[PDB]
Amino acid sequence: QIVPDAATCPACLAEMNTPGERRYRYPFINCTHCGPRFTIIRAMPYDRPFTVMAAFPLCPACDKEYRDPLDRRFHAQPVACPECGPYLEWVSHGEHAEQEAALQAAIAQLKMGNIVAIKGIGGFHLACDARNSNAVATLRARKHRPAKPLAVMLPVADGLPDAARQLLTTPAAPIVLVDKKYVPELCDDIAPGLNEVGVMLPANPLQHLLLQELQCPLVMTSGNLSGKPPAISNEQALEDLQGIADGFLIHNRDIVQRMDDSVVRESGEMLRRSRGYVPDALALPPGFKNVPPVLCLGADLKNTFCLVRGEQVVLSQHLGDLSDDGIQTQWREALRLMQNIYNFTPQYVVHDAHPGYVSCQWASEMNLPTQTVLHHHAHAAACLAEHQWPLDGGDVIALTLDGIGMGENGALWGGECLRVNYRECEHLGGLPAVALPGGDLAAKQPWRNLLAQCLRFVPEWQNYPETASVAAANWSVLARAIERGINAPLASSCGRLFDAVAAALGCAPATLSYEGEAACALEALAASCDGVTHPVTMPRVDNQLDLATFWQQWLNWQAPVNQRAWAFHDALAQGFAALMREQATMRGITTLVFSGGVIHNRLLRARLAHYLADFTLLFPQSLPAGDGGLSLGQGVIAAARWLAGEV
Ligand SMILES: NC(=O)OP(=O)(O)OC[C@H]1O[C@@H](n2cnc3c(N)ncnc32)[C@H](O)[C@@H]1O
Ligand SMILES: [Mg+2]
Ligand SMILES: [Zn+2]
Ligand SMILES: [Zn+2]
Ligand SMILES: [Zn+2]
């Protein structure tokens, strides 16, 4: 029974700070209670000969500790000291150092405002002084990441709320999203236009040495290139990061598994589940038992896979976007080790109903019986699973809010009201389906969605100040592609509705640099408002929200932009609450489920919980609301159809 990778413990930290200890200032100190696990194992059993540490025979001082039953390092599989262990190496445009001098060159570079690649437990990070405006602009410029927020490493948790401090200091040592007023020391280019910052504490010996020296916050972001899987070997770091890093702090212990930092909110809500949680298994809900081995391929974005057997499920670490160049290698190594750890051999494969997905191509290469699950059915089921809804617990009404998933009959869904149990998904209503002009471009340029909404719902849209940039363009070639159905598929996407509103308000750049950027900006804007009396609504017309009425009231209700953003969330929540109410009540349903990437929105949650106080409300918490949780939903639906003896 192997455990997730564990933050360095107090006792090892104390040993590493104590002059005259053999392991004094040694960056690879670990013991039976802490250190790398999943990231250093080649095969089972967990035993030094089958880890990355086979290469380093123990000196005798270490071997006496590893073998002594009453010793903290008894069978510490990756134990070492300066005599027999891995050592640090510094590489900078010509220059070379090792061990302690390697550490000092990295610190001197960080102190002068340079960017250093640092080798971690499960990848490589890029670091620099988080208070240094020039360093941070340079890092963003070199990595072409003009907006996306950067995680920051702090030396200690002092001054953070209690609930943050308590999460930050667990073995898992996650990034924890914290209000940015707690951390005034960070320059303004850390999370521009957002309200929260991701902070973490040192969790490995090398990070402790660095932060003990620097006594200041450090950007500590992933060592990759957009479109590329993160490097896990020295030469792939050297190759990948040379345009970016001014120097490299690497070492000669191999990483064999990609393992990103995990990311939670202070409230405990999981956004990314990797380092420190993988590979822990999860109990399935009551009634699921004797389930055959099922491999669930998850989603094409923010991918995780899932192994289902017996009365448990095991989720992989975050593996990213599956359409990326060589991401299949890492996926496949995670799958090998996971199957070796649990002695797992799949009898069935489950994957998404979208036939253009990479994951559905991989699934047909496996010579197993395969089955398909609707994207939004799976969202809803991951959420019921996580709240321990019983196999036979009854129907719920689900609100599934996201970007785009394939729905029934080739339709693109993302704002749906559903009747849901673990076997069935009936679509009840939701947003109107509205063109995505330019297909994939619709997610990158919010103004296209504003245009598609205006064309369908706003008479004389050209006359509103909020449509000015749109109207000054020759939008009418795009309007004709839309009429004729040329790369302008219909989608009831709630994510594309956020984008239309954000473009109307002008709160995002015209072209976006990351998925969801316009929606986060809109939500960060709405959250500075404490609530307003306003006349904006989204009425119900048969079983869909009436956006003609919404845009007419919204475009004609002048108010500060935060109050306009707040009013949008409120009308949307209210409008969905009215739909879910009619559907639940007239069927005798008393429990409501919410899932999909948009449900990560705090204001929209708070608003829906406000309108739906007459119901039991079920929201994601220990698993991501979005695509990170989808493999689990696939799993419980396949298990449930199986348990019912479905052919
Ligand atoms: N190539 C690539 O994907 O970059 P990456 O994955 O290293 O991005 C950092 C991750 O930390 C999270 N994160 C960090 N700071 C955040 C903030 N202020 N608000 C929301 N999410 C944040 C967020 O989920 C984000 O994906
Ligand atoms: Mg503070
Ligand atoms: Zn320890
Ligand atoms: Zn030794
Ligand atoms: Zn989704």
Side-chain angles (χ1 to χ4, degrees):
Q1 325 133 40
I2 93 131
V3 287
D5 302 271
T8 309
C9 76
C12 280
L13 197 64
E15 176 185 347
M16 184 191 86
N17 291 329
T18 299
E21 286 293 313
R22 200 173 78 265
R23 301 204 175 82
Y24 179 64
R25 297 181 61 82
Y26 187 54
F28 307 91
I29 186 167
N30 54 266
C31 73
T32 198
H33 301 113
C34 80
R37 295 292 181 263
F38 182 91
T39 54
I40 53 106
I41 296 160
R42 295 188 188 279
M44 291 284 90
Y46 180 52
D47 192 358
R48 187 181 191 100
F50 312 113
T51 77
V52 308
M53 290 284 88
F56 301 92
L58 294 171
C59 77
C62 273
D63 193 78
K64 162 165 209 183
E65 289 151 32
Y66 177 91
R67 288 142 112 93
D68 165 6
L70 308 156
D71 192 291
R72 198 178 76 267
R73 301 157 230 97
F74 174 60
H75 291 8
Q77 300 312 328
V79 66
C81 76
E83 254 36 47
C84 62
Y87 57 86
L88 294 169
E89 186 191 321
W90 172 252
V91 161
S92 185
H93 295 88
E95 332 328 286
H96 190 265
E98 43 193 49
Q99 310 176 48
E100 191 60 48
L103 178 70
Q104 298 302 141
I107 287 163
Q109 276 218 354
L110 283 168
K111 268 182 196 149
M112 68 170 156
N114 285 346
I115 301 169
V116 183
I118 301 159
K119 181 160 195 195
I121 292 293
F124 280 85
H125 290 114
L126 296 160
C128 69
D129 186 351
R131 326 166 280 182
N132 183 320
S133 271
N134 288 2
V136 176
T138 295
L139 173 59
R140 285 192 183 280
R142 285 169 195 190
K143 212 182 163 217
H144 317 100
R145 185 208 183 93
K148 205 174 156 150
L150 294 160
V152 168
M153 193 163 280
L154 295 189
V156 292
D158 303 356
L160 294 185
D162 282 351
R165 292 210 321 281
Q166 99 96 59
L167 284 163
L168 287 171
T169 65
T170 51
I175 302 172
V176 179
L177 263 40
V178 111
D179 194 292
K180 73 160 89 153
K181 81 172 198 303
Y182 298 118
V183 205
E185 229 167 33
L186 302 181
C187 75
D188 84 82
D189 212 2
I190 292 312
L194 295 188
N195 296 144
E196 300 167 300
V197 198
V199 304
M200 64 213 292
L201 301 178
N204 76 46
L206 177 49
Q207 295 175 342
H208 274 106
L209 290 164
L210 292 168
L211 272 303
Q212 279 167 193
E213 294 267 7
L214 279 147
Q215 284 318 303
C216 81
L218 289 189
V219 168
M220 198 64 58
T221 190
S222 196
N224 63 255
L225 288 155
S226 296
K228 265 163 146 282
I232 67 175
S233 79
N234 294 172
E235 20 119 56
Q236 190 70 94
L238 295 167
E239 160 101 338
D240 271 21
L241 298 183
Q242 62 162 7
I244 315 160
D246 296 304
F248 299 70
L249 194 47
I250 60 176
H251 62 241
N252 57 337
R253 196 182 61 194
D254 294 3
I255 297 154
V256 289
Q257 289 294 322
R258 186 230 179 127
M259 190 63 61
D260 294 354
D261 300 324
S262 300
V263 179
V264 304
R265 297 212 218 248
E266 170 189 307
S267 77
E269 185 186 353
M270 176 77 77
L271 278 29
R272 286 215 180 152
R273 188 180 178 278
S274 303
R275 186 172 55 71
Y277 311 93
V278 167
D280 287 342
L282 294 162
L284 289 177
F288 292 76
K289 55 183 163 186
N290 177 235
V291 179
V294 178
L295 168 64
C296 307
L297 306 179
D300 269 28
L301 289 319
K302 302 179 156 86
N303 177 269
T304 66
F305 61 78
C306 192
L307 310 186
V308 184
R309 181 178 63 196
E311 65 181 28
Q312 300 170 109
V313 51
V314 74
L315 286 161
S316 73
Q317 70 268 44
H318 171 83
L319 290 155
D321 153 301
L322 301 184
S323 71
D324 280 356
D325 127 53
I327 170 62
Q328 194 196 63
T329 301
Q330 283 178 177
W331 194 87
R332 202 189 283 286
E333 279 287 354
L335 185 54
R336 184 183 75 71
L337 182 55
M338 209 59 90
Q339 288 185 324
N340 189 235
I341 293 180
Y342 289 95
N343 290 139
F344 185 100
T345 310
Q347 277 162 226
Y348 305 87
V349 64
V350 194
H351 67 275
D352 203 275
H354 197 315
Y357 274 14
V358 163
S359 72
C360 310
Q361 180 58 38
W362 301 351
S364 76
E365 294 170 359
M366 300 184 180
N367 202 37
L368 292 169
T370 59
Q371 79 187 255
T372 258
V373 167
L374 296 179
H375 200 78
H376 305 97
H377 193 190
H379 271 323
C383 176
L384 285 173
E386 185 215 299
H387 286 266
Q388 300 302 294
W389 199 259
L391 186 60
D392 80 315
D395 286 357
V396 301
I397 299 304
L399 192 57
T400 64
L401 296 191
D402 65 1
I404 268 98
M406 179 91 125
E408 278 147 25
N409 295 309
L412 312 174
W413 284 355
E416 309 319 319
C417 172
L418 321 151
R419 191 179 62 80
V420 161
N421 56 50
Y422 289 118
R423 301 174 61 199
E424 277 183 295
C425 185
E426 180 183 8
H427 179 262
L428 307 174
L431 294 169
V434 173
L436 319 161
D440 274 354
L441 284 178
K444 305 180 201 205
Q445 319 192 307
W447 68 264
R448 300 164 174 275
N449 300 292
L450 182 56
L451 175 60
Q453 292 279 335
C454 285
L455 283 179
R456 284 280 292 286
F457 306 120
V458 188
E460 299 176 70
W461 61 267
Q462 288 150 80
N463 305 353
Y464 285 96
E466 37 293 264
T467 65
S469 43
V470 169
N474 174 50
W475 57 271
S476 89
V477 194
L478 205 38
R480 296 199 283 115
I482 312 167
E483 293 297 48
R484 296 176 45 188
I486 302 150
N487 195 215
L490 293 172
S492 49
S493 168
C494 189
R496 303 292 83 79
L497 184 59
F498 272 70
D499 288 3
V501 178
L505 282 188
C507 58
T511 302
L512 300 180
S513 48
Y514 68 90
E515 74 128 283
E517 160 181 19
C520 295
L522 191 65
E523 165 188 18
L525 193 48
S528 49
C529 179
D530 281 314
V532 57
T533 287
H534 75 266
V536 179
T537 73
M538 281 204 200
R540 213 178 72 247
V541 160
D542 33 66
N543 292 295
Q544 319 199 126
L545 299 199
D546 167 34
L547 307 173
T549 296
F550 159 76
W551 285 114
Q552 196 212 263
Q553 304 162 325
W554 190 86
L555 283 171
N556 287 292
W557 185 60
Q558 286 80 22
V561 292
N562 59 352
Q563 285 175 31
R564 304 184 85 189
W566 191 95
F568 166 66
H569 289 73
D570 195 54
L572 184 70
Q574 203 283 330
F576 282 133
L579 223 63
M580 295 189 91
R581 183 176 284 108
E582 174 72 13
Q583 291 311 321
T585 308
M586 294 322 283
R587 302 182 161 68
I589 288 164
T590 73
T591 305
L592 309 183
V593 172
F594 301 92
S595 197
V598 171
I599 285 302
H600 276 130
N601 195 309
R602 249 104 42 87
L603 175 55
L604 188 61
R605 276 199 242 116
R607 297 271 90 203
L608 288 154
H610 174 83
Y611 290 111
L612 288 161
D614 47 332
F615 286 99
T616 302
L617 302 182
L618 265 33
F619 294 99
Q621 166 90 354
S622 55
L623 277 210
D627 284 357
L630 198 89
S631 62
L632 179 87
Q634 295 179 337
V636 298
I637 300 157
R641 301 179 164 163
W642 188 82
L643 289 159
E646 290 180 21
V647 11

